[PDB]
Amino acid sequence: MSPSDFLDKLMGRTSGYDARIRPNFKGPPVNVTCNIFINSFGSIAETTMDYRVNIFLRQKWNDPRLAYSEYPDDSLDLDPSMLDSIWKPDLFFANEKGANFHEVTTDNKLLRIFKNGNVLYSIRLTLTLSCPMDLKNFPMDVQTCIMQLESFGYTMNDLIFEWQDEAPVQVAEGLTLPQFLLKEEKDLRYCTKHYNTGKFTCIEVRFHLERQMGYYLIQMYIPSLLIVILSWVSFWINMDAAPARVALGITTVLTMTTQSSGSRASLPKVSYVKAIDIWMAVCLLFVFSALLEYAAVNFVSRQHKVFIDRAKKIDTISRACFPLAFLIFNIFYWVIYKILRHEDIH
Amino acid sequence: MSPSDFLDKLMGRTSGYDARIRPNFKGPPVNVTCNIFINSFGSIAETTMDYRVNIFLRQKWNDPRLAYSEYPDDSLDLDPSMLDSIWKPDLFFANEKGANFHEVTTDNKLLRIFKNGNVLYSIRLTLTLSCPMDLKNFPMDVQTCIMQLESFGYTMNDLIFEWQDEAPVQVAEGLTLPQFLLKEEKDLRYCTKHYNTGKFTCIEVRFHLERQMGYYLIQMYIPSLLIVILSWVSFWINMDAAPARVALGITTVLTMTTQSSGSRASLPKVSYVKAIDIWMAVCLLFVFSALLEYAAVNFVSRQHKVFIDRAKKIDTISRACFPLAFLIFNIFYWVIYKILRHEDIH
Amino acid sequence: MSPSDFLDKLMGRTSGYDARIRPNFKGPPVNVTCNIFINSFGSIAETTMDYRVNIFLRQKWNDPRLAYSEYPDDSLDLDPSMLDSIWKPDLFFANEKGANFHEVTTDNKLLRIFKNGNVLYSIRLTLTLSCPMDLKNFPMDVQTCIMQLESFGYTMNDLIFEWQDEAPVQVAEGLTLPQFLLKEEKDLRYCTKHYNTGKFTCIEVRFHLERQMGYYLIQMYIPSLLIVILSWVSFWINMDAAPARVALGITTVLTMTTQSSGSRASLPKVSYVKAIDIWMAVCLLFVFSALLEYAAVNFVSRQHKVFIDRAKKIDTISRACFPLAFLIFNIFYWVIYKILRHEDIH
Amino acid sequence: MSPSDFLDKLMGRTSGYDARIRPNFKGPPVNVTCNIFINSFGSIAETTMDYRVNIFLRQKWNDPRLAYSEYPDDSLDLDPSMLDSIWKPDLFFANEKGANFHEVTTDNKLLRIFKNGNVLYSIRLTLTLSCPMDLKNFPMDVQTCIMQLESFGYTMNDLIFEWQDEAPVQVAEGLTLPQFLLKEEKDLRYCTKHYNTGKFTCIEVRFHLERQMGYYLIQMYIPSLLIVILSWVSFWINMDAAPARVALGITTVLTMTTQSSGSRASLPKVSYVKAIDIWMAVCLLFVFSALLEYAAVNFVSRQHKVFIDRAKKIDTISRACFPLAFLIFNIFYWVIYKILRHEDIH
Amino acid sequence: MSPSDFLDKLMGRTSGYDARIRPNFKGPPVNVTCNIFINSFGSIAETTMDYRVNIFLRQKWNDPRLAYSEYPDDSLDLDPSMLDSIWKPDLFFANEKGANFHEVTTDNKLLRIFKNGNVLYSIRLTLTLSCPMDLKNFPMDVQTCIMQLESFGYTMNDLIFEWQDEAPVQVAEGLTLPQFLLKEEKDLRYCTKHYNTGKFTCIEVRFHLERQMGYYLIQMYIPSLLIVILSWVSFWINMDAAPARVALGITTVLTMTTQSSGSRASLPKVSYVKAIDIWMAVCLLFVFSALLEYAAVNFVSRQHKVFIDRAKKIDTISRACFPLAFLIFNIFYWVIYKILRHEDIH
Ligand SMILES: *[C@@H]1O[C@H](CO)[C@@H](O[C@@H]2O[C@H](CO)[C@@H](O)[C@H](O)[C@H]2NC(C)=O)[C@H](O)[C@H]1NC(C)=O
Ligand SMILES: *[C@@H]1O[C@H](CO)[C@@H](O[C@@H]2O[C@H](CO)[C@@H](O)[C@H](O)[C@H]2NC(C)=O)[C@H](O)[C@H]1NC(C)=O
Ligand SMILES: *[C@@H]1O[C@H](CO)[C@@H](O[C@@H]2O[C@H](CO)[C@@H](O)[C@H](O)[C@H]2NC(C)=O)[C@H](O)[C@H]1NC(C)=O
Ligand SMILES: *[C@@H]1O[C@H](CO)[C@@H](O[C@@H]2O[C@H](CO)[C@@H](O)[C@H](O)[C@H]2NC(C)=O)[C@H](O)[C@H]1NC(C)=O
Ligand SMILES: *[C@@H]1O[C@H](CO)[C@@H](O[C@@H]2O[C@H](CO)[C@@H](O)[C@H](O)[C@H]2NC(C)=O)[C@H](O)[C@H]1NC(C)=O
Ligand SMILES: [Zn+2]
Ligand SMILES: [Zn+2]
Ligand SMILES: [Zn+2]
Ligand SMILES: [Zn+2]
Ligand SMILES: [Zn+2]
Question: Any idea which positions bind strychnine (chains A, B, C, D, E)?
Answer without folding.
Answer: 195-200
